[PDB]
Amino acid sequence: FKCVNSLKEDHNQPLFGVQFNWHSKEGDPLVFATVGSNRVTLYECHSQGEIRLLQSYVDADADENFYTCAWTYDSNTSHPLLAVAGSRGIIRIINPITMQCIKHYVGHGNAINELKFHPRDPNLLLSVSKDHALRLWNIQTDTLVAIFGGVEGHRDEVLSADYDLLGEKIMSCGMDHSLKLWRINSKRMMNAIKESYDYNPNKTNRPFISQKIHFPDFSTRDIHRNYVDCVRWLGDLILSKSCENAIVCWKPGKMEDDIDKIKPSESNVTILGRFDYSQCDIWYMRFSMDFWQKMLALGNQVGKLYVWDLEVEDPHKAKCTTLTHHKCGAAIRQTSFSRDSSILIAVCDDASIWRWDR
Ligand SMILES: CN(C)[C@H]1CN(Cc2c(F)cccc2Br)C[C@@H]1c1cn(C)c2ccccc12
C-alpha cells in the first residue's frame, strides 16, 4: 500500500465512519461513503489517486451527529441504498444517486452507534443503541422484527455488533465490557422474520408484533477490561477490541467446543491469539476487514495504520504491516477496504480522508 491522496471535509468535525459500497456495479468506479457532523458524503475513486466528490445528504437538524453507515441494495430493483444513523436515534435510508432520504425509522429515539446489514438478506438491518438494546428491522415491510435487551442483555451502551457468515447469529458488545451472542436461527426468530415479510399494514388491522429477546445465548466479560468498541466474526471465532491496544481472537467455550453446541450457561472462553499495537487506548476506534476476510485494518490515535494478513494457518500467526504518512497525525476512527482490497480509506478526527492503493 502507498498513500496516493488525502482531503479534508469542510465541517472540521470527526469522521466517525467510512464504507465502500461492495454492491457497486461492474464497470462503475469504486464509491465510498463518509459520515460525520450532520452529513453523509459520497466519493468516487479514480486513477492517479483522484478522490472525486459527488454529493452529500445534510440533516435538517444542525445538532444531528451521524455515527454510522451501511450499504445495501433494493431487493426488487438492485439499486444500492445507504443507511445512516447517529445521535438523534433516527435511521435514514438514503438513495445514494440523488441523496434523497427515502424513508426513516425510529425505535425509542436514543443514539444509534452502529448499523449492519444481514449478509444474506439485504432487507434485514441491525441497529445497536445507547439505550442498551439491539434492534432488527425489515426495511422491505418497514417492520421492527425484534428487540434484543432485558436485564440479561447489555447494561450500558451497545457499541458494535456483527452477524456471522450466514446471518444465523449476532455477537454484540459495549460499555458494560461484555460480548453477547444472540441466535437468530431459532424457530422463534425464523418465524418472526417470515411474519415480518407477510406484514402489510394496508391489508390488516393488527400492528406488527416485535419479538422481545431478553436472554443472550452466551455472554462474557472475560476478554477485555474496558469498553468493547468493535467486534467481528472470523468464521466461528471472534475478533474484538477495547482500548487496551489489542484485538483479541477468541471463542466461546473450550478449544474443541462447537459454537452451535454452546449453552447460555457457558462460563469458559478460549483465547486463540492477540494482535497488539500502540497508541490506540482512547475509546471508540473501529477495525475493519476486507470482503474475503483475508485482511484486517485498524488506525490509531496518532494517524498510523496497522494491517494484518490473516491468510495463515492459525490466528496468532497473522502478519502485520504498518502504514504511516508524515502529514497524517489525527486519530483514525474507521477504515474501509474496497471489495477487491486494492484501496484502503482511512478517516480521521480532523475530518481528513486518506487513500492508500496497492
Ligand atoms: C458517545 N458514544 C458512546 C460515541 C460512540 N461513537 C460511535 C463509535 C462506537 F460506538 C464504537 C467505535 C467507534 C465509534 Br466512532 C459515537 C459517539 C461519540 C460522540 N462524540 C462526540 C464522539 C467523539 C469521539 C468519539 C466518539 C464520539
Q: Which three cell numbers stand for residue 332?
A: 483514525
Q: Which residue has the cell 476487514?
A: 289
Distance CA 357, CA 167 (A): 31
Experimental method: X-ray
Q: How far is CA 247 from the centre of its chain?
A: 16
Distance from the alpha carbon of residue 225 to the mean position of ligand 1, in angstroms: 18
Ligand 1 binding pocket, CB closer than 6 Å? 14, 16, 67, 113-114, 157, 159-160, 229-230, 284-286, 333
Distance CA 237, CA 318 (A): 14
Among 301, 262, 273, residue whose Cα is nearest residue 168: 262
Q: Which of 35, 67, 126, 287 to mutate to test the pocket of ligand 1 (most atoms within 8 A of CB)?
A: 67
Neighbours of 321 (CB within 10 A): 12
The whole domain housing 281 covers: 1-358
CATH of the domain at 209: 2.130.10.10
| Nearest atom in ligand 1 to 86's CA | 16
Residue nearest to atom 14 of ligand 1 (CA): 284
Residue nearest to atom 23 of ligand 1 (CA): 14
Neighbours of 225 (CB within 10 A): 11
Q: Which contiguous run of DSSP H or E holds residue 118? A: none
Q: Which of 37, 66, 113, 130 to mutate to test the pocket of ligand 1 (most atoms within 8 A of CB)?
A: 113
What is the number of domains present in the chain?
1
Among 243, 340, 350, residue whose Cα is nearest residue 286: 243
| Nearest atom in ligand 1 to 175's CA | 3
Among 129, 117, 56, residue whose Cα is nearest residue 88: 129
Q: Which of 160, 284, 334 to mutate to test the pocket of ligand 1 (most atoms within 8 A of CB)?
A: 284
Distance from the alpha carbon of residue 125 to the mean position of ligand 1, in angstroms: 20
**What phi, psi does 140 have (nearest 5°)?**
-85, -50
Which positions ≥6 away from 84 have C-beta within 8 Å?
A: 33, 35, 40, 57, 66, 68, 69, 91, 92, 94, 115
Q: Which of 16, 64, 114, 160 to mutate to test the pocket of ligand 1 (most atoms within 8 A of CB)?
A: 16
Which positions ≥6 away from 322 have C-beta within 8 Å?
A: 304, 305, 306, 307
Residue nearest to atom 13 of ligand 1 (CA): 284
Q: Which residue has the cell 435511521?
A: 91
Distance from the alpha carbon of residue 66 to the mean position of ligand 1, in angstroms: 10
Among 156, 136, 131, 161, residue whose Cα is nearest residue 146: 136
Distance CA 1, CA 209 (A): 49
Q: Which three cell numbers stand for residue 274?
A: 492477540
Return the DSSP state at 30.
E
